[PDB]
Amino acid sequence: ATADTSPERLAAIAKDALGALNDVILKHGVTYPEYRVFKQWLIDVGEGGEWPLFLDVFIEHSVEEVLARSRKGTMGSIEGPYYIENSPELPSKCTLPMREEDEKITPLVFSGQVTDLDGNGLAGAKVELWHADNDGYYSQFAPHLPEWNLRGTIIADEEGRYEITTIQPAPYQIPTDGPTGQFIEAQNGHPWRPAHLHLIVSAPGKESVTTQLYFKGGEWIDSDVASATKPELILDPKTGDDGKNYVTYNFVLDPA
Amino acid sequence: ATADTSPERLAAIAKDALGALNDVILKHGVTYPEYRVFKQWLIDVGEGGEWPLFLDVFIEHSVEEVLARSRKGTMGSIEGPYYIENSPELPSKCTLPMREEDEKITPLVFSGQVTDLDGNGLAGAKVELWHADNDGYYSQFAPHLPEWNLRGTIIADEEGRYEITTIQPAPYQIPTDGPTGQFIEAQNGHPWRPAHLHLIVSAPGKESVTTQLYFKGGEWIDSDVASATKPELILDPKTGDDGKNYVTYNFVLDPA
Ligand SMILES: Oc1cc(Cl)cc(Cl)c1O
Ligand SMILES: Oc1cc(Cl)cc(Cl)c1O
Ligand SMILES: [Fe+3]
Ligand SMILES: [Fe+3]
């Protein structure tokens, strides 16, 4: 990873950030024992490979909020830590890869259209979808799972539309024993994210959008540990006589 | 390391700290490329074992500043990362362990008295002294050095006094290639600490003081990268006809 940042912009960000943290120590009268625990915890975060987790939970929302200002299309949200590039391509009307066991969960049929800002549809738009299974696991972050379970890149047809059948994910819990979980537990917090689909939607000549979609009335919807939920991102699926849940949701992309 | 912190105090510190960092992202419009570099850097800090270095340089000063409020004795300063407990004991009038090569550097003769707050001297006071050599290396953090080079615990006599001969340390440079050095270099900073003695002074029934002492007119005295220098901590050694530098400095300890 690289960025264009000048020495002066970095100096300014650094002075503010560090000044901020020093101000917090002075405000709260942080003690030497607390400092020692803070130091060992930072070390444990790295040793337990949780920098992506901790930052995406506690920081990324502010980075998306910055990005949000320059966008007029559908609301974005954080990528989070579990995105994998180049998920296998599926047809405009498809079902995500899933195990037999996934197949016993009430189906979720997700329809809509990728369009531009004036409302014109888009040929060759791709919807990358990833989410957790009913157990709350992601493929490639759970050895039992086929590597593309509930992962795909859907090719939207000439008109910019898709019909993706999947399952509704379960809410996600940050493992309690890790440093991030330990951090949460020490302040009497909830290590939970509401159930969510992750999507990256792209089209030729267009600025891709990373977003998440949530489920009306679902638990933790009002207390996401990642501060990543937005009202505009909440789905209200309706159930069909096949007992399947149906939702339609359209994506609106900005120009590149 | 453990601390007594309640879930509510931790919650409050966390909300402030995180809120602070999020506020900085929003202020400066931190970008996704910058976030990715920030994430890989945090990972590199841990992989390069620099959490003690980075925190002691950029944070510890605020923790000592908090501690300073409750103390009426000599000014403290940060411990920094290179303290080692149980350095071998030496007599009230002693010379620190050093190599032949150290012995060609103009001697520093450091005298004074450990006393209480009303000015009474103290039997069985210990002055733990550690510092870098003329090359800027610490023993136990440099494989070529004898493990207690320029390290000792001096036993102050019945009256609370010592006469420690050593050398003046060189200024210390944070290695430029590490993540901390890289951080400094990216903002056009100086990776330098002024030359300094580290001392932990203790006495029976007394609250120990961690401090540092610096050298008047020495370089980086006005721009310590650790923000750890104080006016009260600056020595003005006088040179003797043996061409040795002499300084006297007294420690005043609080009750435990
Ligand atoms: O699946 C996730 C897991 C974590 Cl820890 C954080 C976010 Cl934002 C996720 O989307
Ligand atoms: O010897 C030192 C080295 C670093 Cl990096 C920081 C401090 Cl505060 C020191 O005293
Ligand atoms: Fe997720
Ligand atoms: Fe030092």
From Swiss-Prot, chains A, B:
Coiled coil: none
Keywords: Aromatic hydrocarbons catabolism, Dioxygenase, Iron, Metal-binding, Oxidoreductase
E.C. numbers: 1.13.11.1
This protein's record includes keyword Lipid biosynthesis: no
GO MF, one example: ferric iron binding
Keyword Nucleotide-binding set for record: no
Enzyme type, top EC level: oxidoreductase
Details of cofactor binding: Binds 1 Fe(3+) ion per subunit.
Catalytic activity: catechol + O2 = cis,cis-muconate + 2 H(+)
Entry binding sites for Fe cation: Y138, Y172, H196, H198
SUPFAM superfamilies: Aromatic compound dioxygenase
GO BP: any one term: catechol-containing compound metabolic process
PROSITE patterns to which the protein is assigned, alphabetical: INTRADIOL_DIOXYGENAS
Cofactor(s) it depends on: Fe(3+)
Family: Belongs to the intradiol ring-cleavage dioxygenase family.
NCBIfam families: catachol_actin
Protein name, as recorded: Catechol 1,2-dioxygenase
Organism: Rhodococcus opacus (Nocardia opaca)
